[PDB]
Scaffold this active site. Structure first.
Site, PDB file in Angstrom:
ATOM      1  N   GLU A   1       0.658  -1.181  -0.060  1.00  0.00           N
ATOM      2  CA  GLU A   1       0.094  -0.054  -0.163  1.00  0.00           C
ATOM      3  C   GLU A   1       0.696   1.402  -0.012  1.00  0.00           C
ATOM      4  O   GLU A   1       0.501   2.407  -0.774  1.00  0.00           O
ATOM      5  CB  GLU A   1      -0.891   0.084   1.096  1.00  0.00           C
TER       6      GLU A   1
ATOM      7  N   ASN B   1      -7.713   8.553  -5.943  1.00  0.00           N
ATOM      8  CA  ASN B   1      -8.481   7.582  -6.339  1.00  0.00           C
ATOM      9  C   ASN B   1      -9.373   8.244  -7.655  1.00  0.00           C
ATOM     10  O   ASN B   1      -9.686   9.381  -7.828  1.00  0.00           O
ATOM     11  CB  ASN B   1      -9.509   6.832  -5.568  1.00  0.00           C
TER      12      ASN B   1
ATOM     13  N   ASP C   1     -12.457   8.216  -8.133  1.00  0.00           N
ATOM     14  CA  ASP C   1     -13.702   8.926  -7.834  1.00  0.00           C
ATOM     15  C   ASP C   1     -13.537  10.335  -6.914  1.00  0.00           C
ATOM     16  O   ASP C   1     -14.437  10.903  -6.538  1.00  0.00           O
ATOM     17  CB  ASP C   1     -14.533   8.024  -7.039  1.00  0.00           C
TER      18      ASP C   1
ATOM     19  N   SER D   1     -11.754  10.713  -4.033  1.00  0.00           N
ATOM     20  CA  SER D   1     -11.243  10.393  -2.904  1.00  0.00           C
ATOM     21  C   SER D   1      -9.904   9.907  -2.900  1.00  0.00           C
ATOM     22  O   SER D   1      -9.341  10.103  -3.946  1.00  0.00           O
ATOM     23  CB  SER D   1     -12.041   9.157  -2.228  1.00  0.00           C
TER      24      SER D   1
ATOM     25  N   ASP E   1      -6.535   8.048  -0.736  1.00  0.00           N
ATOM     26  CA  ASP E   1      -6.124   7.011   0.272  1.00  0.00           C
ATOM     27  C   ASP E   1      -4.910   7.799   1.086  1.00  0.00           C
ATOM     28  O   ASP E   1      -4.091   8.379   0.455  1.00  0.00           O
ATOM     29  CB  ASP E   1      -5.520   5.954  -0.485  1.00  0.00           C
TER      30      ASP E   1
ATOM     31  N   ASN F   1      -8.993   5.331   2.881  1.00  0.00           N
ATOM     32  CA  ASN F   1      -9.533   6.161   1.975  1.00  0.00           C
ATOM     33  C   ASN F   1     -10.567   7.005   2.534  1.00  0.00           C
ATOM     34  O   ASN F   1     -11.295   6.925   3.472  1.00  0.00           O
ATOM     35  CB  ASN F   1     -10.464   5.003   1.105  1.00  0.00           C
TER      36      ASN F   1
HETATM   37 CL   LIG Z   1     -13.024   1.083   2.166  1.00  0.00          CL
END
Ligand SMILES: [Cl-]
Ligand SMILES: O=C(O)c1cc(N2C=C(CCO)NN2)cc(C(=O)O)n1
Ligand SMILES: O=C(O)c1cc(N2C=C(CCO)NN2)cc(C(=O)O)n1
Ligand SMILES: O=C(O)c1cc(N2C=C(CCO)NN2)cc(C(=O)O)n1
Ligand SMILES: [Cl-]
Ligand SMILES: [Cl-]
Ligand SMILES: [Cl-]
Ligand SMILES: [Cl-]
Ligand SMILES: [Cl-]
Ligand SMILES: [Cl-]
Ligand SMILES: [Cl-]
Ligand SMILES: [Cl-]
Ligand SMILES: [Eu+3]
Ligand code: NA
Ligand code: NA
Length: 129
Positions: A35, A46, A48, A50, A52, A59
């Protein structure tokens, strides 16, 4: 902060992540490697809109507030910036909520794709825990 492998394993263990919801420590170390490369300051946007955040790439769509993810939730009740701290407490406590939501560690797509079903104990081999 960029943790060492065993350094992160020890911090995660101290914060109660070893075997949490049945996921051995190596699973959590593996997830963090892929990650964030063990870097607490990791961020990724991301599709959309959002973002991380942190060692476990938590998220803003669901878990934290960053003020720029319209329509999102903040289920860990924290600013996303807390997830970037050198102290992993907030990331660990939020991860506990995530992994408890029903889908276990499949919430972390990198865990499902790169850690699940592998010899994850290798990630803590040689560490003094
Ligand atoms: Cl999630
Ligand atoms: O960069 C690495 O590959 C690396 C760095 C490490 N460390 C260890 C420290 C000291 C911890 O206090 N910092 N980075 C540890 C390991 C490993 O165990 O394979 N690997
Ligand atoms: O000492 C380490 O922890 C270490 C050394 C590495 N390497 C790789 C080389 C090149 C080949 O000998 N030298 N040290 C690579 C890594 C890692 O990817 O985790 N870790
Ligand atoms: O030997 C190393 O330096 C080493 C081995 C690692 N791993 C990871 C696996 C699992 C699958 O490849 N086995 N050894 C991971 C790291 C690191 O994160 O610094 N370092
Ligand atoms: Cl280390
Ligand atoms: Cl393990
Ligand atoms: Cl928002
Ligand atoms: Cl922005
Ligand atoms: Cl909320
Ligand atoms: Cl906030
Ligand atoms: Cl810590
Ligand atoms: Cl599960
Ligand atoms: Eu290494
Ligand atoms: Na273990
Ligand atoms: Na908050």
């Amino acid at each position: 902060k960029v943790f060492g492998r065993c350094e992160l394993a020890a911090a995660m263990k101290r914060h109660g992540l070893d075997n949490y919801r049945g996921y051995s420590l190596g699973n959590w170390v593996c997830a963090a490697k892929f990650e964030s490369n063990f870097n607490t300051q990791a961020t990724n946007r991301n599709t959309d809109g959002s973002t991380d955040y942190g060692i476990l790439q938590i998220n803003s769509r669901w878990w934290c507030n960053d003020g720029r993810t319209p329509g999102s939730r903040n289920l860990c009740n924290i600013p996303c910036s807390a997830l970037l701290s050198s102290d992993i407490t907030a990331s660990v406590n939020c991860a506990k909520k995530i992994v408890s939501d029903g889908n276990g560690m499949n919430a972390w797509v990198a865990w499902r794709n790169r850690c699940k079903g592998t010899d994850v104990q290798a990630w803590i081999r040689g560490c003094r825990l």
